[PDB]
């Protein structure tokens, strides 16, 4: 199979800068017929990947000239002018000279944004969810720039490392940020063996960390 | 203009199931269609191809899954058709068709389909209250499979929200979302989140209440 190679990883970039996205064939995708075939998808975060540019530099129906895709042979470049906000998102190369058609793993884009602290709220578990026999314990962390975060669970001064979910969202399309959500899931026992629950949110907008609290 | 996949759902490991791909405002018959699926794990994932009437019918296949999965298309009702027999835990993904090498070239929303021995379970909907802005919850927890849908006040509460991603551990997945509105707003005026599990059949309305 064809390997397609792509770097890198991941390419944040100023709004109204140039991005540049590069991807590799393990093989040459140039056909006896003289079409290189070669096509770059975006995926949106929440949705289906779409066609972006096809055959290195055609453009796909309603796509700005602001993307371009140059290239020959095995090395091609996907590059993303003035960017824009709505622009964020995993882009992906192909090919489809030879069966089966093969994708790269994937290039982030991720819009730079002036830096925002978590906006951070803790909530208790719920009666209805007591009654139950369960004891989650939600955190939210919200609208936050850079990506990189840590959150800290500490039960009475004490961290917890087990017994925690998080979930991650990508950045969002409108305003650059992230948003995280943290739950220390406890039976109701041991939530009731402590009193003094705290989330404990490490990032660079502070030099010590945001800290929410309750004591049950 | 559209494409529009149907048919997936849960099914057990060994199990059989069909996926549709009905088009919309153009022809299938005259473009090369294709099935492709996607994880986490192993990203896109070309899955089959079935070319036209004047092309035979050729098809071709991901070595995963030959002998397993059969490509069709139906022009006469503008659709194309995936079978997937002896299904594996790994073919779980969600699956896509398009036309290529056509100016109809859409992915439509795609198709999911769980392949798992674990059973269909509804989610306990919790509501999360506090102990200038508000900042409000729901917890989805103990659900199976994908997915529920969480709005707020039935989607008239759109800014301001963030619904996470939901997260698998083992065989039960939990969602959390989160509101936030002016201090003025609640508990003046009603927040109620809305969950929806199509799977299990569950509908469930939480009014977040002070305290
Ligand atoms: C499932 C995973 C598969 C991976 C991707 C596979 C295939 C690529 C996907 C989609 C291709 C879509 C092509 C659409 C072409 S219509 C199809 C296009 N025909 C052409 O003539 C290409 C255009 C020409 N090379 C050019 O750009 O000047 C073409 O690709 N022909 C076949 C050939 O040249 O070999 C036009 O409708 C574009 C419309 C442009 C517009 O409206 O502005």
């Known amino acids: 199979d064809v390997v397609m190679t792509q770097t890198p990883l991941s390419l944040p970039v100023s709004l109204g800068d140039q991005a540049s996205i590069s991807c590799r064939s393990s093989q040459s995708l140039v056909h006896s017929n003289g079409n290189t075939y070669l096509h770059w998808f975006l995926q949106k975060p929440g949705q289906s990947p779409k066609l972006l540019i096809y055959?290195?530099?055609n453009r796909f129906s309603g796509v700005p000239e602001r993307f371009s895709g140059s290239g020959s042979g095995t090395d091609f470049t996907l590059k993303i002018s003035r960017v824009e906000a709505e622009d964020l998102g995993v882009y992906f190369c192909s090919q489809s000279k030879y069966v089966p058609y093969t994708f790269g793993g994937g290039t982030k884009l991720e819009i730079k944004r002036a830096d925002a602290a978590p906006t951070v709220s803790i909530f208790p578990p719920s009666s209805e969810q007591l009654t139950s026999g369960g004891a989650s314990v939600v955190c939210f962390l919200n609208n936050f720039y850079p990506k990189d975060i840590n959150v800290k669970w500490k039960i009475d001064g004490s961290e917890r490392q087990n017994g925690v979910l998080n979930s991650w969202t990508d950045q969002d399309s409108k305003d650059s940020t992230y948003s995280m959500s943290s739950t220390l899931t406890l039976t109701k026992d041991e939530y009731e063996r402590h009193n003094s629950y705290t989330c404990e949110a490490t990032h660079k907008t502070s030099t010590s960390p945001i800290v929410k609290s309750f004591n049950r | 203009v559209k494409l529009e996949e149907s048919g997936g759902g849960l099914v057990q490991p060994g199990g059989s199931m069909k996926l549709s791909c009905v088009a919309s405002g153009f022809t299938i018959s005259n473009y090369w269609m294709n099935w492709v699926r996607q994880s986490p794990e192993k990203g896109l994932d070309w899955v089959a191809e079935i070319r036209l009437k004047s092309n035979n019918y050729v098809t071709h296949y991901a070595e995963s899954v030959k002998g397993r999965f059969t490509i069709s298309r139906d022009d006469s009702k503008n659709s194309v058709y995936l079978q997937m027999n002896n299904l594996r835990p790994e073919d779980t993904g969600i699956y896509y068709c398009?036309?290529?090498?056509?100016?109809?070239?859409?992915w439509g929303q795609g198709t999911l389909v769980t392949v798992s021995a674990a059973k269909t379970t509804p989610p306990s909907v919790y509501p999360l209250a506090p102990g200038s802005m508000v900042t409000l919850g729901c917890l989805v927890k103990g659900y199976f499979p994908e997915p529920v849908t969480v709005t707020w006040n039935s989607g008239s509460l759109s800014s301001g929200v963030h619904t996470f991603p939901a997260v698998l551990q083992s065989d039960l997945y939990t969602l959390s979302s989160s509101v936030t509105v002016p201090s003025s707003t609640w508990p003046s005026e009603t927040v109620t989140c809305n969950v929806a599990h199509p799977a299990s059949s569950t509908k469930v309305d939480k009014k977040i209440v002070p305290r």
């Open positions: 055959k290195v530099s």
């Open positions: 398009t036309p290529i090498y056509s100016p109809f070239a859409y």
